Amino acid sequence: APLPMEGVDISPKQDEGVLKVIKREGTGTEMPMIGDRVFVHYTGWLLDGTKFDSSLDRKDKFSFDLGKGEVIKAWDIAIATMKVGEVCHITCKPEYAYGSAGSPPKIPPNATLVFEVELFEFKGEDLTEEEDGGIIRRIQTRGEGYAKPNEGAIVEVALEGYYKDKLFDQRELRFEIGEGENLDLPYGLERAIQRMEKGEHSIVYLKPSYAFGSVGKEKFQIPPNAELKYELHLKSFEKA
Protein backbone atom coordinates (compact mmCIF):
# COMPACT_ATOMS: atom_id res chain seq x y z
CA ALA A 1 0.00 0.00 0.00
CA PRO A 2 1.39 3.48 -0.88
CA LEU A 3 3.75 5.35 1.42
CA PRO A 4 2.38 8.74 2.42
CA MET A 5 4.39 11.69 1.06
CA GLU A 6 4.74 14.79 3.28
CA GLY A 7 7.56 17.35 3.26
CA VAL A 8 9.46 15.06 0.90
CA ASP A 9 12.28 17.46 0.06
CA ILE A 10 14.65 17.20 3.03
CA SER A 11 17.59 18.95 1.29
CA PRO A 12 18.94 21.94 3.28
CA LYS A 13 19.04 23.96 0.05
CA GLN A 14 15.53 22.77 -0.89
CA ASP A 15 16.69 21.87 -4.40
CA GLU A 16 14.86 18.50 -4.42
CA GLY A 17 18.30 16.85 -4.00
CA VAL A 18 17.18 14.37 -1.33
CA LEU A 19 13.56 13.23 -1.34
CA LYS A 20 12.33 11.16 1.56
CA VAL A 21 9.32 9.02 2.36
CA ILE A 22 8.86 6.88 5.49
CA LYS A 23 8.23 3.19 4.91
CA ARG A 24 7.85 2.28 8.59
CA GLU A 25 7.71 4.91 11.30
CA GLY A 26 10.21 4.63 14.14
CA THR A 27 9.85 4.93 17.92
CA GLY A 28 10.13 7.77 20.39
CA THR A 29 11.12 11.29 19.37
CA GLU A 30 14.95 11.49 19.30
CA MET A 31 16.95 11.66 16.08
CA PRO A 32 20.72 11.28 15.75
CA MET A 33 23.12 14.11 16.51
CA ILE A 34 26.37 15.12 14.78
CA GLY A 35 29.10 12.58 15.51
CA ASP A 36 26.74 9.90 16.88
CA ARG A 37 27.66 6.41 15.78
CA VAL A 38 24.67 5.16 13.75
CA PHE A 39 23.85 1.54 12.96
CA VAL A 40 21.92 0.94 9.75
CA HIS A 41 20.97 -1.60 7.11
CA TYR A 42 20.62 -0.37 3.56
CA THR A 43 20.04 -1.25 -0.05
CA GLY A 44 20.74 0.95 -3.06
CA TRP A 45 19.32 0.72 -6.58
CA LEU A 46 19.78 2.56 -9.86
CA LEU A 47 16.65 4.00 -11.54
CA ASP A 48 16.64 1.02 -13.91
CA GLY A 49 16.25 -1.29 -10.88
CA THR A 50 19.88 -2.48 -10.80
CA LYS A 51 20.65 -3.28 -7.13
CA PHE A 52 24.23 -2.00 -6.74
CA ASP A 53 24.86 -2.54 -3.00
CA SER A 54 23.30 -3.81 0.22
CA SER A 55 24.42 -4.46 3.78
CA LEU A 56 21.63 -7.02 4.38
CA ASP A 57 23.74 -10.10 3.63
CA ARG A 58 26.62 -8.89 5.81
CA LYS A 59 27.35 -10.16 9.34
CA ASP A 60 26.39 -6.98 11.17
CA LYS A 61 24.95 -3.52 10.56
CA PHE A 62 26.85 -0.92 8.66
CA SER A 63 28.01 1.78 11.09
CA PHE A 64 29.60 5.24 10.81
CA ASP A 65 29.79 8.68 12.48
CA LEU A 66 26.90 10.83 11.34
CA GLY A 67 27.42 14.29 9.82
CA LYS A 68 31.15 13.90 9.17
CA GLY A 69 31.06 13.14 5.43
CA GLU A 70 31.95 9.48 5.98
CA VAL A 71 29.06 8.63 3.66
CA ILE A 72 27.34 10.33 0.73
CA LYS A 73 25.65 13.66 1.49
CA ALA A 74 22.17 12.18 1.00
CA TRP A 75 22.83 9.72 3.83
CA ASP A 76 24.16 12.34 6.28
CA ILE A 77 21.03 14.39 5.45
CA ALA A 78 18.51 11.51 5.47
CA ILE A 79 19.70 9.56 8.49
CA ALA A 80 19.66 12.71 10.62
CA THR A 81 15.89 12.88 9.99
CA MET A 82 15.20 9.29 11.14
CA LYS A 83 13.89 7.96 14.45
CA VAL A 84 15.27 4.74 15.92
CA GLY A 85 13.57 1.74 14.23
CA GLU A 86 12.45 3.82 11.21
CA VAL A 87 12.71 2.56 7.66
CA CYS A 88 12.79 5.24 4.97
CA HIS A 89 13.03 5.40 1.18
CA ILE A 90 15.17 8.16 -0.36
CA THR A 91 15.69 9.36 -3.93
CA CYS A 92 18.89 11.35 -4.31
CA LYS A 93 20.28 13.46 -7.14
CA PRO A 94 23.95 12.87 -8.09
CA GLU A 95 25.15 16.08 -6.34
CA TYR A 96 24.13 14.29 -3.10
CA ALA A 97 25.53 10.89 -4.05
CA TYR A 98 28.36 9.87 -6.39
CA GLY A 99 28.52 12.88 -8.74
CA SER A 100 30.33 12.82 -12.11
CA ALA A 101 32.51 10.01 -10.81
CA GLY A 102 30.48 6.99 -9.78
CA SER A 103 31.08 3.86 -7.79
CA PRO A 104 32.70 0.92 -9.57
CA PRO A 105 31.49 -1.10 -11.28
CA LYS A 106 27.72 -0.58 -11.07
CA ILE A 107 27.05 3.19 -10.69
CA PRO A 108 27.55 5.51 -13.69
CA PRO A 109 28.33 9.26 -13.89
CA ASN A 110 25.52 11.66 -12.91
CA ALA A 111 23.23 8.94 -11.49
CA THR A 112 20.04 9.50 -9.48
CA LEU A 113 19.81 6.72 -6.88
CA VAL A 114 17.24 5.23 -4.58
CA PHE A 115 17.99 3.80 -1.13
CA GLU A 116 16.09 1.89 1.51
CA VAL A 117 17.61 2.64 4.94
CA GLU A 118 16.72 1.26 8.34
CA LEU A 119 18.05 2.99 11.43
CA PHE A 120 18.58 0.43 14.18
CA GLU A 121 20.37 2.45 16.85
CA PHE A 122 22.49 5.53 17.42
CA LYS A 123 25.01 6.15 20.20
CA GLY A 124 26.37 9.50 21.41
CA GLU A 125 30.07 10.21 22.08
CA ASP A 126 29.64 12.46 25.11
CA LEU A 127 28.91 10.25 28.14
CA THR A 128 28.60 13.05 30.71
CA GLU A 129 25.33 14.09 32.42
CA GLU A 130 26.06 17.75 31.79
CA GLU A 131 27.21 17.04 28.23
CA ASP A 132 30.49 18.91 28.78
CA GLY A 133 32.87 16.78 26.69
CA GLY A 134 34.62 15.37 29.78
CA ILE A 135 34.03 11.73 28.78
CA ILE A 136 34.24 11.02 25.02
CA ARG A 137 33.55 7.54 23.65
CA ARG A 138 34.80 5.98 20.43
CA ILE A 139 32.87 2.71 20.11
CA GLN A 140 34.96 -0.17 18.74
CA THR A 141 32.40 -2.94 19.03
CA ARG A 142 28.70 -2.39 19.82
CA GLY A 143 27.43 -4.43 22.78
CA GLU A 144 24.37 -6.62 23.14
CA GLY A 145 21.06 -5.90 24.89
CA TYR A 146 19.62 -2.56 25.99
CA ALA A 147 20.47 -2.99 29.70
CA LYS A 148 23.22 -0.78 31.12
CA PRO A 149 24.91 -1.03 34.55
CA ASN A 150 23.47 1.30 37.20
CA GLU A 151 24.91 2.55 40.48
CA GLY A 152 25.67 -0.51 42.61
CA ALA A 153 25.82 -2.90 39.68
CA ILE A 154 28.50 -5.59 39.74
CA VAL A 155 30.47 -5.34 36.51
CA GLU A 156 33.29 -7.35 34.97
CA VAL A 157 35.61 -5.27 32.83
CA ALA A 158 38.94 -5.44 31.00
CA LEU A 159 40.68 -2.06 31.00
CA GLU A 160 43.85 -0.41 29.66
CA GLY A 161 44.62 3.17 30.73
CA TYR A 162 47.04 5.31 28.73
CA TYR A 163 48.60 8.66 29.43
CA LYS A 164 50.18 10.17 26.31
CA ASP A 165 50.10 6.70 24.68
CA LYS A 166 52.06 5.16 27.59
CA LEU A 167 50.30 2.27 29.32
CA PHE A 168 49.88 2.78 33.10
CA ASP A 169 47.15 0.30 34.08
CA GLN A 170 46.07 -2.98 32.54
CA ARG A 171 43.65 -5.15 34.49
CA GLU A 172 40.57 -7.31 34.43
CA LEU A 173 38.30 -6.60 37.42
CA ARG A 174 34.95 -7.45 38.88
CA PHE A 175 33.69 -4.61 41.03
CA GLU A 176 30.67 -2.65 42.21
CA ILE A 177 29.94 0.62 40.36
CA GLY A 178 30.44 3.37 42.99
CA GLU A 179 33.35 1.52 44.66
CA GLY A 180 35.86 1.91 41.79
CA GLU A 181 37.79 4.73 43.51
CA ASN A 182 39.24 2.16 45.93
CA LEU A 183 40.58 0.19 42.96
CA ASP A 184 42.27 3.30 41.50
CA LEU A 185 39.64 3.72 38.78
CA PRO A 186 38.80 7.34 37.99
CA TYR A 187 35.23 8.67 38.30
CA GLY A 188 34.92 9.03 34.52
CA LEU A 189 35.63 5.33 33.93
CA GLU A 190 32.81 4.37 36.28
CA ARG A 191 30.45 6.83 34.63
CA ALA A 192 31.47 5.56 31.16
CA ILE A 193 30.72 1.95 32.19
CA GLN A 194 27.17 3.00 33.18
CA ARG A 195 26.64 4.12 29.58
CA MET A 196 27.88 0.84 28.09
CA GLU A 197 26.12 -2.42 27.15
CA LYS A 198 27.18 -6.01 27.61
CA GLY A 199 30.11 -6.91 25.33
CA GLU A 200 30.73 -3.30 24.32
CA HIS A 201 34.36 -2.42 23.53
CA SER A 202 34.97 1.31 23.61
CA ILE A 203 37.80 3.80 23.79
CA VAL A 204 37.02 6.51 26.33
CA TYR A 205 38.84 9.82 26.63
CA LEU A 206 38.77 11.51 30.02
CA LYS A 207 39.39 15.16 30.75
CA PRO A 208 41.27 15.78 34.06
CA SER A 209 38.14 16.62 36.13
CA TYR A 210 36.74 13.16 35.20
CA ALA A 211 40.13 11.55 35.75
CA PHE A 212 42.64 12.06 38.57
CA GLY A 213 42.19 15.83 38.60
CA SER A 214 44.51 18.43 40.05
CA VAL A 215 46.64 16.04 42.13
CA GLY A 216 47.15 13.12 39.74
CA LYS A 217 47.94 9.50 40.51
CA GLU A 218 51.46 8.93 41.82
CA LYS A 219 51.28 5.12 41.68
CA PHE A 220 50.60 5.35 37.92
CA GLN A 221 53.04 8.27 37.37
CA ILE A 222 50.07 10.43 36.31
CA PRO A 223 50.72 14.15 36.88
CA PRO A 224 48.17 16.89 37.74
CA ASN A 225 45.73 17.99 34.97
CA ALA A 226 46.23 14.84 32.91
CA GLU A 227 43.90 13.79 30.09
CA LEU A 228 43.59 9.98 29.96
CA LYS A 229 42.57 7.36 27.41
CA TYR A 230 41.13 3.98 28.37
CA GLU A 231 40.34 0.97 26.25
CA LEU A 232 37.31 -0.49 28.05
CA HIS A 233 35.58 -3.87 27.56
CA LEU A 234 32.37 -4.36 29.51
CA LYS A 235 32.26 -8.12 29.72
CA SER A 236 29.13 -8.59 31.78
CA PHE A 237 27.21 -7.17 34.70
CA GLU A 238 24.46 -7.81 37.23
CA LYS A 239 22.28 -4.82 38.00
CA ALA A 240 21.60 -3.66 41.61
Swiss-Prot record:
GO MF term set: ATP binding; copper-dependent protein binding; FK506 binding; GTP binding; heat shock protein binding; nuclear glucocorticoid receptor binding; peptidyl-prolyl cis-trans isomerase activity; phosphoprotein binding
GO annotation terms (biological process): androgen receptor signaling pathway; chaperone-mediated protein folding; copper ion transport; embryo implantation; male sex differentiation; negative regulation of microtubule polymerization; negative regulation of microtubule polymerization or depolymerization; negative regulation of neuron projection development
Enzyme Commission number(s): 5.2.1.8
Maturation and modification: Phosphorylation by CK2 results in loss of HSP90 binding activity.
Record flagged with keyword Repeat: yes
Assigned keywords, A-Z: Acetylation, Cell projection, Chaperone, Cytoplasm, Cytoskeleton, Isomerase, Isopeptide bond, Methylation, Microtubule, Mitochondrion, Nucleus, Phosphoprotein, Repeat, Rotamase, TPR repeat, Ubl conjugation
Modified residues (Phosphothreonine): T128
Subunit structure: Homodimer. Interacts with GLMN. Associates with HSP90AA1 and HSP70 in steroid hormone receptor complexes. Also interacts with peroxisomal phytanoyl-CoA alpha-hydroxylase (PHYH). Interacts with NR3C1 and dynein. Interacts with HSF1 in the HSP90 complex. Associates with tubulin. Interacts with MAPT/TAU. Interacts (via TPR domain) with S100A1, S100A2 and S100A6; the interaction is Ca(2+) dependent. Interaction with S100A1 and S100A2 (but not with S100A6) leads to inhibition of FKBP4-HSP90 interaction. Interacts with dynein; causes partially NR3C1 transport to the nucleus.
Protein name per UniProt: Peptidyl-prolyl cis-trans isomerase FKBP4
Source organism of the structure: Homo sapiens
